[PDB]
Structure formats: C-alpha cells, structure tokens
Amino acid sequence: MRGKVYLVGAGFGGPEHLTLKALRVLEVAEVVLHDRLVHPGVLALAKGELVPVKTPQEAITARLIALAREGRVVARLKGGDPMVFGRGGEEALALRRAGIPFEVVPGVTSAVGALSALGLPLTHRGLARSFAVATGHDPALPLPRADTLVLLMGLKERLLERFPPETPLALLARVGWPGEAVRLGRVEDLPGLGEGLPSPALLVVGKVVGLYGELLPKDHGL
Amino acid sequence: RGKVYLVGAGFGGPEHLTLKALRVLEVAEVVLHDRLVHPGVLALAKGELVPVQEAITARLIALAREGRVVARLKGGDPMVFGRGGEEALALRRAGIPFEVVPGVTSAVGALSALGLPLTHRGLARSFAVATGHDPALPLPRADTLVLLMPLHTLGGLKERLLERFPPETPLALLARVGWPGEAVRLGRVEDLPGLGEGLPSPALLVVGKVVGLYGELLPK
Numbered sequence: 001m002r003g004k005v006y007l008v009g010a011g012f013g014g015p016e017h018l019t020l021k022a023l024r025v026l027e028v029a030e031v032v033l034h035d036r037l038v039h040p041g042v043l044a045l046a047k048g049e050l051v052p053v054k055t056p057q058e059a060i061t062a063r064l065i066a067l068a069r070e071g072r073v074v075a076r077l078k079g080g081d082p083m084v085f086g087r088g089g090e091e092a093l094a095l096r097r098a099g100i101p102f103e104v105v106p107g108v109t110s111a112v113g114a115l116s117a118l119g120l121p122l123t124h125r126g127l128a129r130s131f132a133v134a135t136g137h138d139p140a141l142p143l144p145r146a147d148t149l150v151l152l153m154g155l156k157e158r159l160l161e162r163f164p165p166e167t168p169l170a171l172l173a174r175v176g177w178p179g180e181a182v183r184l185g186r187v188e189d190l191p192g193l194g195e196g197l198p199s200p201a202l203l204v205v206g207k208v209v210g211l212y213g214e215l216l217p218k219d220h221g222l
Numbered sequence: 223r224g225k226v227y228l229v230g231a232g233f234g235g236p237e238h239l240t241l242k243a244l245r246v247l248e249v250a251e252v253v254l255h256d257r258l259v260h261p262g263v264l265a266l267a268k269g270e271l272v273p274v275q276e277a278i279t280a281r282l283i284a285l286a287r288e289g290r291v292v293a294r295l296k297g298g299d300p301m302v303f304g305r306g307g308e309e310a311l312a313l314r315r316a317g318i319p320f321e322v323v324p325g326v327t328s329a330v331g332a333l334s335a336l337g338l339p340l341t342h343r344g345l346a347r348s349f350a351v352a353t354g355h356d357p358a359l360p361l362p363r364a365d366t367l368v369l370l371m372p373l374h375t376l377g378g379l380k381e382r383l384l385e386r387f388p389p390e391t392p393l394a395l396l397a398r399v400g401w402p403g404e405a406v407r408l409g410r411v412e413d414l415p416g417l418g419e420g421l422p423s424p425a426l427l428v429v430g431k432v433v434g435l436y437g438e439l440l441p442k
Contacts, residue, residue, distance in 0.1 A: 009334070016242040017324060019232065023241065081326075081334050089339030089432070092439055106238055106326045106334040108299075116230070116299050119322040121307030130362040132350035144348040146362035208307075215310055219225065219319040 001101055003068030006075040007082040007091055009107015010034075012114040013176020015041040022105050025075055031067055033060055034077035035086075037200070039177065046077070057087050061094045068100045080110030085135060085152065111150045111202055114175035118182070119215050121208060122148045128208040136203075148206035156190035159205060163187055168209035173201035184212050224286040226313055227293040228300040230325020231255075233332045234400020236262040242323050246293050252285055254278060255295035260401065267295070275305050279312045286318045299327045303353060303370060328426060329368045332399035336406070337439050339432060340366045346432040354379045354427060361386055366430035373425055376415035383411050383429060392433035393417070397425035408437055 006025045011017035018026075026032065026046045033051045034043060043050060053060050060076070067074045082088040082104055095102040108117075111133050115122060122131040128147030135152045143149065143162050159169075165188035173181045185193045187205060227246045232238035239247075244266060247253070251269045264271055278294070285292040300306045300322050313320045326334075329351045333340060340349040346365035354371020357378025361367060363386055371379065383393075389412040397405045409417040411429060418425070 007337075011240070016245075017240050019238045019240055019326060020244065021237040081330055083334040083337075083339040083341075084330060085341050087343065089342045089435065089439075092337050092339065093435065096439060102337070104334050104337040106232075106331040108240060108324045108326060109330060112299065112302065112327065112330070113324045116301040116306075116322055116324040119228070119301070119310045119320070121301045121310070123303060124307040125305075129359070130350060130352035132348055132362055132364045134348035134364070138347065141347070144350055144362065144364035146350045146352075146364065211307065211311065214314060215307075217314075219321055221319070 001068070002071040003100065004073050005064050005068050005095055005100055005102040006105055007088055007102065008075050008077050008105045009081040010038050010042045010077050010079055011108040012080055012110045012117070014039055015045055017108045017113065017117070017176070018042060018045070019106060022107060025105055026077070028073060029075035030072045031074045032077050033063060033074070035079050037079055038077055042077070057090065061091055064091065065095065065098045065100055080113065081107045084109055111152055114172065114202060115150075115204065117176055118172070118218075120204075120212055122150065122204070124208050124211060127210065128206050148204065148208050151203040153200050155194070156187060159187050159190070163205055167205055168207065168212070169193070169203065169205045170209045170212050171197055171201055171203055173198040175202065182216060184209070184216070223291065224289045224319065225291050226282050226286050226318055226320040227291075227323055228306055228309055228320065229293050229295050229323040230299040231259045231263045231295050231297050232326040233298050233328035234335070235260055236266055238326045238331065238335070238400065239263055239266070240323065240325060243325060246323055247295075249291060250293035251290045252292045253295050254281060254292065256297055259295055259297055269293075275308065279309055282309070282313065283316050283318050297328070298331070299325045302327050302329070303351075328399065329370060332396060332426065333368075333428060335400055336396070338428075338436055340368065340428070342432050342435065345435070346430055357382060366428065366432050369427040371425075371427060373418050373421055373423060376418050379427070380411065380414040383414070387411050387429055391429055392431065392436070393427065393429040394433050394436055395421055395425055395427055397421045397423065406440065408433075
C-alpha cells in the first residue's frame with residue numbers, strides 16, 4: 001500500500017518539544033487531522049492540508065482509513081503523546097484491524113512532560129517513589145494510589161480519600177503556552193485555590209509537591 | 223553566560239530527541255552524559271562528551287562557574303526516576319542558572335513507539351509508574367502499572383504484583399526498545415519470572431487489562 005497513517009504526538013506546548021521524527025512526519029504528511037487545541041507553532045510546521053477535529057471519534061478513524069486507502073500518507077496530530085488517553089489506542093487498533101499501515105510517533109506528555117519542563121519532579125528521595133496519572137472525567141470511580149498523583153483536567157472530597165487535607169497540591173494551567181499559570185497550596189485550599197484558573201490544567205498532589213516553591217522559578221537570564 | 227541544561231535524551235535513537243534537546247546538544251560546550259546514552263544521540267553533541275551523583279553535581283556547578291554552558295544528558299526524561307530533582311535543587315540552592323529540557327520517557331515513550339497504549343476507555347483509565355529494584359516495597363495501584371526494573375527482581379515483584387492483579391492478568395516485558403537487541407515478551411502475571419528468561423537489559427514491565435491488546439497491536 002502507498003497509504004499510511006502516522007499517529008503523532010505534538011508534545012505539551014511549543015514546537016521546540018516536538019521530536020525529530022514528529023517534525024519529519026509533519027513535513028511529509030499530505031493531510032493532518034489535528035486536535036483543535038494544538039499549539040499554533042506546531043500546526044505551522046505542517047506542510048500538508050490541516051483538518052481540525054466535539055468531533056465523533058468514529059468520523060476521525062473512518063477518515064484516516066479512507067485517506068490511506070486512497071493511497072495518501074496522513075497524520076493524526078494529538079496533544080501530548082498520541083497513546084496517552086485521547087483514544088489513541090482505539091485508533092491504532094482500528095488501523096490494524098482495517099489492514100492499514102501505521103506508525104506511532106511518541107510525544108512529550110501533557111502531564112509528565114509539562115512538569116519536567118518546569119523543572120518539577122514527580123518523585124524524590126523521602127517524598128515519593130511512585131506516581132500515577134488519571135483524568136477527572138469519571139468522578140464516580142476511585143482514584144489510583146501512588147505517592148504522587150497527577151490529574152489531567154467534589155474534587156477536594158475525592159482527593160481526601162487518597163491524601164490528607166494538609167498535603168501539598170499544585171495546579172498548573174497552560175504550561176508552555178501564553179497565559180501559563182501555576183498555583184501552589186494544599187488539598188484543603190480547594191476548591192477556592194482553583195476557581196479562576198485557565199484551561200486546560202494539570203493537578204499534582206503529594207509530599208513531593210512541597211519542593212515546588214523552591215523549584216518553580218525559572219532562569220531569569222540576569 | 224554560565225548555565226546548566228538538564229537534558230533528556232529520549233528512550234532510544236535520535237529520532238525521538240526533541241528539537242530543543244537537539245539545540246542544546248549543538249550549543250553545549252561540555253556534556254556530562256550517562257555512559258549508556260544512545261550513540262546516535264551522543265553523535266549529535268558538538269561539545270566535548272564527558273561520560274559519567276554527588277561528584278556529578280559538583281562538576282556541573284564547577285563548569286557553570288567557569289562561565290561554561292554545560293549539559294547533563296540523561297536517557298529518557300531528566301526529571302523522571304533519577305536524581306533530576308536532586309540536581310535541580312542543588313543547582314538552584316547554588317544559584318546556578320539552569321533549564322530542564324524534557325525527553326520522551328521509556329515508561330510511556332517506548333510503549334508508544336511500538337504502538338502500545340497504557341490507557342483505553344474500556345480497559346484502563348489510570349496508570350502508575352515505579353521502579354522494580356526493591357521488591358519488598360508495596361506497589362502503587364492503577365489500572366495499568368509500568369515498572370522500570372532489573373530483571374533479577376522479577377521473582378520478588380511477582381509477589382507484589384499478585385497483591386495488585388489476578389494471576390491471569392496480561393503482562394509484558396519490553397527490553398531495549400528502540401535499540402539493537404529490542405525484545406518483547408507477552409504473557410500473564412503467573413508466567414513470572416520465567417517469562418523474562420534470557421531477556422537483555424535494560425527492560426520494563428507493563429501489566430494490566432490493556433496489555434491484552436498488545437499481541438494484536440504488534441506486528442506479526
């Protein structure tokens with residue numbers, strides 16, 4: 001087949017965090033079905049037809065398959081890593097089952113990657129040896145258990161079922177984007193500490209967050 | 223002008239290096255890199271490659287104070303499961319200018335590169351990452367668990383894993399992904415430790431219902 005689909009990660013922010021392979025794919029891809037919230041600088045590097053994609057997943061998947069069968073090289077461009085949440089695994093399965101050649105191009109994740117960009121650790125001797133990542137879409141279901149919990153996008157209540165009210169908590173919105181905002185406090189400070197924060201945002205809770213005040217500042221170049 | 227960059231090299235070849243890491247490798251004067259960083263990545267360093275904790279840090283600071291731009295090159299991401307936090311704290315407390323450059327982790331990146339997900343709306347809505355160096359320690363709890371570990375602790379980890387997952391739970395061992403010698407083993411928790419017999423290092427373990435999809439997702 002001439003057709004091929006690349007599931008591409010755009011990273012958490014600007015194009016400087018794109019991987020070299022991701023860059024190549026965005027140059028050669030004839031058509032790119034990209035998430036609406038993909039950084040402008042990343043989209044600007046795509047030299048094919050940009051197609052923004054709430055759009056039903058069935059439509060996205062069918063179109064990727066249709067395009068490849070037409071003999072085109074196309075890309076699905078997604079924030080962060082293409083396989084972390086965001087139905088990437090379902091897209092991969094569908095392509096495999098349809099007999100469509102495809103490759104997955106890793107990206108710096110929306111969670112872990114953003115925190116590292118700010119020089120913030122998820123683990124640290126004596127504070128945390130493990131971390132878990134989850135989303136806030138199913139408030140009725142239990143949260144995972146790890147020394148450090150990262151939540152993408154009754155909140156205080158549920159966190160209390162995993163951490164004491166005094167546990168350090170960080171809220172990081174639009175990291176790497178204009179309007180980036182970070183708030184440091186404790187679980188008990190919620191919901192107040194949140195309300196007013198831009199979107200989308202990340203939440204990190206656990207003893208390791210206690211180091212964020214000293215590590216958050218960036219090099220000022222002075 | 224003296225500054226330190228904590229740079230992630232990604233889990234494998236230069237193809238997974240970020241643009242920013244590429245720039246740091248082209249600009250840095252000295253590069254203190256983990257002795258095992260992919261050669262394809264080290265090849266991109268234009269400064270002097272210095273194969274290489276307490277001492278490491280002291281040297282970073284030392285070099286910076288000489289007014290040099292140095293890079294601490296680590297496999298994967300600079301802040302994930304290393305001493306990145308310790309290094310950053312040290313640099314900051316020493317008043318040294320520094321920037322952290324993220325890289326694709328092996329924990330997520332290596333799986334993604336193979337077209338393997340840690341999440342799926344029907345099979346896994348959370349994942350956790352930890353090391354498997356100390357099997358006496360309880361493991362985190364998530365739908366999908368990823369452990370970075372020495373293959374010699376598989377026997378002990380099996381005990382901790384059965385305390386988190388039914389014995390029939392799909393489990394995968396992925397070694398040297400993205401490197402020559404890449405090898406993948408698919409089985410179930412009950413297959414440990416034999417499932418990893420003869421596997422090369424470094425390797426990671428992934429376990430959970432989502433792992434049941436790996437056989438179909440991987441090429442024949």
